[PDB]
Amino acid sequence: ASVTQTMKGLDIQKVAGTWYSLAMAASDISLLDAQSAPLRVYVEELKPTPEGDLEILLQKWCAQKKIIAEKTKIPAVFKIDALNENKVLVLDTDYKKYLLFCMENSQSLACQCLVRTPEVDDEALEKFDKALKALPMHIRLSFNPTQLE
Amino acid sequence: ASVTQTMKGLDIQKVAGTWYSLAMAASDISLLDAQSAPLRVYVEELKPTPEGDLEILLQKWCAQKKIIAEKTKIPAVFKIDALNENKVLVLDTDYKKYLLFCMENSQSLACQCLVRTPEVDDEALEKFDKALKALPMHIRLSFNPTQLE
């Protein structure tokens, strides 16, 4: 992906709190085509620190995971400093309703559409679809309302 | 789905021969979100009979399967008479390049875009995307050129 695509003027503090993963897309099928695929994870909560890092509460196959994404020089880009280099890229958010982001396997690329509340609305899903057009995506997933919880 | 969506004036004889599954979509994630999901099958060959039925050579997880789809009153709609009622619905084809079809769990619905040859072209993928707009699809899959074989 390009920095052109990442978010401008992100305030990390305002993304705090509860989120729900409404849809996912990935550049290769293997990343999402099974409950136990490595990036088939559901964001539960986001928690900025006072130091500007991003704590991420995930659900996997479900287990609770916690990962820390440290800030980098580029804003809206965060580094999950595990053994295998993974970046978190925030593409866009209005903070109060939706948040789009991707994960890069520093090649592969999985993105998500996050919503604050399962409120009936499709701004997120529209804006997400409109951002994925510019990226190569080979698998694409949307969760119905019984899938949320 | 509706009969409005199925193909008009299908000649079953002209779909004979080799095909490749370039993309799949389904109404529920579970139908395709794993190599061993029940409708994660790849058409290898189609073989009309002189009696107007449709033999279907599939690849699964890969194993070779063979299933017979018998003709019904509605043309372009075929019945896979197994224990669990499954219909095959041909939505459209020009015979010489693409073929779109769905499978119904008489509720659930998985469709595919089939091409004659991995020839670089995107009529099939365009016409497929344009037919899926009218159907509820929650998982969506496209195969790159190393995935074909």
UniProtKB/Swiss-Prot annotation, chains A, B:
Disulfide linkages recorded for this protein, renumbered to the chain, are 102-111, 102-113
Q: Which UniProt keywords apply?
A: Allergen, Disulfide bond, Milk protein, Retinol-binding, Secreted, Signal, Transport
Pfam families in the cross-refs: Lipocalin (PF00061)
What GO terms fall under cellular component here?
extracellular region
GO terms for MF: identical protein binding; long-chain fatty acid binding; retinol binding
Q: What is this protein's name?
A: Beta-lactoglobulin
- Establish whether keyword NADP is in the entry: no
Lineage top rank: taxon: Eukaryota
Query: What post-translational events are described?
Result: Alternate disulfide bonds occur in equal amounts in all variants examined.
Which locations, inside or outside the cell, does it occupy? Secreted
The entry describes its oligomerization and partners as: Under physiological conditions beta-lactoglobulin exists as an equilibrium mixture of monomeric and dimeric forms. Interaction with LMBR1L which mediates the endocytosis of LGB has been observed in PubMed:17991420, but not in PubMed:23964685.
